[PDB]
């Protein structure tokens, strides 16, 4: 009856709701990975901790419980800090478990001795180095609860080697119960009535449904709220799917005109950050009334004054708004100058998009490639879209129908999360298909992770590379003594990386090769790579 | 006419609700204090930034909007981080405005150049170095709003000298409006009913009223709650006053008894920290069920599992409880085996208290001295108690009837907040009398600030020193080569410091002098000091 | 036999050369202060850890081994970060020992649980929380060694409660030997001959003697080099005493003219920071050639380029400059246009200084008061001068004849170091007298420490308060509502604080009261206070 620290941590994580663990083993975190599998936690051995830390953050967004990134002492943990910042920026729960040198070797210049707690502090809600084996379950339970309660964030546990490998009696350790699900605070009664009056007194109302509404699991109530009020709504890049992107109330093609003309905006789990242009002119009405629904009280009132503050959980507050529509029913009129003005902009944009999508010139364009892509993604798949032009075009091109089904660079604009987040999507959804659509540069960050996807049999992932030979484009030839900083090797056969694990690679340059190569890639028994070449001068609209 | 960065900061502070500023002037924050008085902010020049930063955190607890501590670059700002940590520990809104060297001198070894941002960060919710003059009102509103929203805390603004001395067109500076009061969060209706179920099913219930409820300013709602349900309640040291200490529902004389045998406990703005012994045995039921009411979601479930999590503002949640109680009337029975057990200990403990306050022996004891102080403090006064035994015995002997009328060491257990919090209490309540009962050791931390109190005419403050010649006691004689590390000068006449500003000092050794000296000091036109000698053996 | 962690760290501190400890006791650092006295370390209980941490940094400058500031967990340690920063700014060795809650209570909201390592690190060369009891001497030896080797600085030791109270058999504890003194590296012969060739070519040379040369204890070698070369030298505020302030080679009364007209400058343990105007115009020649002698290689070349870099110990490199002169003797001539120019400004500034001292009017001025103070201070006493004008006017008027005999605000310009530094001076030098000349504003930062000085029988300290009723002056009548932010109580009786411990206070307001009150305060058997009133509108020599 002797239990080790790695055993205690592994069982504690499984008890507190951890199911997926990513990272790379080594001194001294080897036992933690072995016991994680022996306790019911799937461990995925990545090729670089940077990509593994991004996968851990994506699990916190998809499942509601934090994903664990395991890194060795010193540099292994430091690589994982990149993911901590991403979870810090996107408000996602995630745990970074970093090994450390033997505590009795501190100050001696031990192997991989580093100020790991201080390196994780700027992006962590919680840092801790446990003091004893018997109190390890206290730190794990506190680490999980801190990551999901309130505004979700990243936490870090510093595990010295002697605690990982030390042993003690099992009857003496105490395992706390699985901490309850994150409490859902509600808005005050008087504020819900004030939020309705502002919406009922709006000439040009607008609803913004963002990442916070998707993470809050509030898809049912938002669809009930919008369909009952018939309000025009705008989805964030990762709010797509909370409300179906083919819904009539969506004004996404007229995004710029809606934000510029709106006088009362309802924020549903979204922030007025760089993505929303800080809510300031010339993109917004300088006197726009703002109703903000957010779980963080400090976020309320950022950049733009907030007239009605709905501090609390997006799912708990939206039920109050739905409860307001029962003792006081109200619908927004279906024919106003605001509706007809917007609906003209959508039909104009959609005509321009289709006119650009139907162009078949070679070298191909984004819209031409995204036509064959869009018509082959099933309505229940998971889109992973990383890149610059590729990601932005696909945002408006590829629709989503279920919540939390699109993953991109997020609020931090991080390159390198792509293949990492795609593996996390296949670990959470092993029966659904994941489309990891990448640019040539973004794929180069975590490109070696294609072998990881195949080693765990994640054939539900199809890697699609939109290549234009550089960051925003590159030439057809390169002078080795005069390479542009953004240029890459022209016509780089990235798809030949599929031969590492015996998979299929496709090199597409003409619209005829597009659909057949894509069709056979999805049917493959191993993760296939489709490398599509486009024009370097191809741009947006 | 043009406006300077110092004048921009002062007006923006006043607009966002700042009314009190403490600190010491100097390079380069001198113009800030000048426009502070000019824009209507009461500035108080302290003797040390350490005591000033504690007065700032006290104003945040008393008013609901953060007091400001103004410190010079380098050493001045670093001294103010103490109060930042105190507000960080007590969840109080507080602002430290530390000057900096001119930005065009960074890296040159400028005057008082220091990593001030990194020094404040471990205790700050928000550190910011404003980038330009036009955006100064943006950072000021963001600092105040971040200090009072959510769980209150301390923030820090790094103001370089050139930002302070620079000027620009006044009409080109945009001042955001006064940010609204801290938004109230409410608990789900199912959580209210589950808390009522646990309280109704409780064999031995207990309500712990903490200072989080006092800061929430829910005294009117907590009294409607407890008076309706007749639940026995225990108030934290700074939770006193939310309910009058003479209320029959109080079980404070038997604190160690109720915490030991309470099957269901209701935490009303109270934290299960070291004060509550972590909610663990031997002082707690190993299976105690907790109904936790706190605004910080991360705090819920700490140390002890929380069955009913009432996350949100204490005033809004208590209002839900009262609304539920008047639609579903329930009262804890007045005759219970639980009521008859605590009441016996309350009567038994109260008997030993009376037999200790009747002690007339010289040197005196804590209980004899506090008996006369208790008889002379009105019901509307404010008590500031600091020390160890002096403060703990004063917690159980001083009665508080209005909320937020007692200021002690706080959740940090800080020695040095005494005179700072007393000065803050006198500036917020110039109409009430402020009692500052200090230990001789605690008085050494900030006793120089009696001049600050006298300089601003704060004759409503009475400094009472309870002197046992050291930290928990001191010997009668001292040899300089054999001074105990906890001993001070025997019979140190601290009251002589009242003669610095021409005040009255009093030296009491026998109970015959207690009442006359205390009554004479309250009537003094200048802040008087009463130095009371007590026995080093009394416990 | 079993030994506790408190006794392990107390013995290890004494073994590593720690002699003085300042702080305030309380949970959980009580056994440390008790066991320190049992092991030979002298503990001084202050009234505030802030003043104690300033006293601990002063011990490092006076002795070369770090003084220790002892603080309780949480707020006790945070108060002691001020001294860490002051030692960090002045490059002095200093150790802050802060308590911490029991390790088995982390994350529980324990009593005074705080992120103390992070609070100290911005000013720390070394932060460490010892992992076990048997390795406590390892962390003590490394902390001392780090604080004194290379560029000296402040270190921090984080001691949890159960590390202090735990015990184990004394045999298993390895006590490392007393770490050797700081090594004294030196410059190449090429750099030595180049620096000597630079001085030999200077039309208008100037030598700057900073407290880095004082800390290095190179007073004999500096006096041997300067008296051989006859080079005009300027002494920084705490660089005074390395050379006798009454030296014909001193051009301090003409500091502005010397720094401007100089074309070659030798930096002896002094930085080109705010105190030296960054070596920039209009106070310096734009084409000034600089020879910099500094222990820190990273400091070489700051603001102004360094033609000749002499990286190493000031005492070791000055020895090389003397060996080079013993083989190639060279003297700067004493009748140059550079000399006669500086002396013309010196004689005229000295006349204006002598005139302001002759003023007998009431209220008195800084010069009349210092005229009497200067004449009652022995040539081997220690000067603690803190304030604004009080500190700056005193530096020109208070001559120091021995190195490391003046303590002021330092490179950080700190208010609150005064009384703490005076107590540390008296503890190091109980034979010499300590004069603590303070401004009325500066005195209030740590005024309660007068009782600490009396409690330990420090009769060799005399507290002198130059009172102008505010920060740089103040009115003579105060309305309690309309209070200037820089003014204090008019005619405050700070001398009454001496009566706390039975001492004697003196309230001086006339010139005929200075000498009788000052002469009797020095001879008191308890530390006395002399509160001297001056004019609020009193300035310095323009
Ligand atoms: N369960 C929840 N209920 C309400 N708000 C939440 C919840 N979880 C996160 N949020 C808030 O949602 C916000 C995230 O918005 P953001 O991701 O920037 O919008 P976008 O979708 O445009 O990226 C955060 O400020 C966070 O506080
Ligand atoms: N407006 C508020 N409503 C509810 N809880 C609050 C509010 N403001 C602060 N709190 C909480 O009250 C708690 C105060 O507990 P503590 O400082 O330990 O006081 P005490 O122990 O004296 O009750 C903090 O944890 C804080 O999160
Ligand atoms: N033993 C030593 N030998 C040489 N230089 C030293 C030694 N100790 C410290 N120093 C240097 O002295 C410098 C201190 O300069 P500073 O305090 O600015 O002098 P001052 O204030 O007297 O002008 C530091 O840069 C430090 O590197
Ligand atoms: C970690 C990180 N590194 C770098 C960047 C900057 N960045 C943004 S997009 C991009 C390259 C885009 O690659 P790709 O998809 O090939 O470009 P596109 O063809 O879509 O323009 C880079 C380097 C970033 N946002 N994050
Ligand atoms: C900043 C700080 N320094 C030191 C302490 C340790 N401490 C706790 S209570 C106390 C003073 C106790 O003495 P006193 O105030 O005279 O009261 P007594 O208990 O003797 O009546 C001290 C120094 C602390 N809590 N905070
Ligand atoms: C910690 C700290 N707080 C504040 C200052 C600003 N400051 C510089 S000098 C000084 C005091 C000036 O008054 P005083 O000591 O009476 O000197 P005087 O003008 O009489 O010479 C102050 C507060 C500082 N340098 N350090
Ligand atoms: Mg590209
Ligand atoms: Mg005492
Ligand atoms: Mg003055």
Author numbering:
A (entry chain E): 2 to 542
B (entry chain B): 2 to 540
C (entry chain A): 2 to 543
Sentences from the paper on this structure:
Based on the kinetic characterization ApbHACL/S, DhcHACL/S and TbHACL/S are the top three variants that showed the highest catalytic efficiency toward acetaldehyde. All structures contain well-defined bound ThDP and ADP. All our HACL/S structures contain bound ADP in the R domain, which assumes the Rossmann fold nucleotide binding unit.
One such enzyme is 2-hydroxyacyl-CoA lyase/synthase (HACL/S), which catalyzes the reversible cleavage of 2-hydroxyacyl-CoA (2hcCoA) into formyl-CoA (fCoA) and an aldehyde or ketone. Originally identified in the mammalian α-oxidation pathway of 3-methyl-branched fatty acids, HACL/S has demonstrated remarkable catalytic reversibility, as it is capable of condensing fCoA with various substrates covering a wide range of aldehydes and ketones with different carbon chain lengths. All the enzymes are tetramers, specifically dimers of dimers (α2), where α2 dimer represents a catalytical unit.
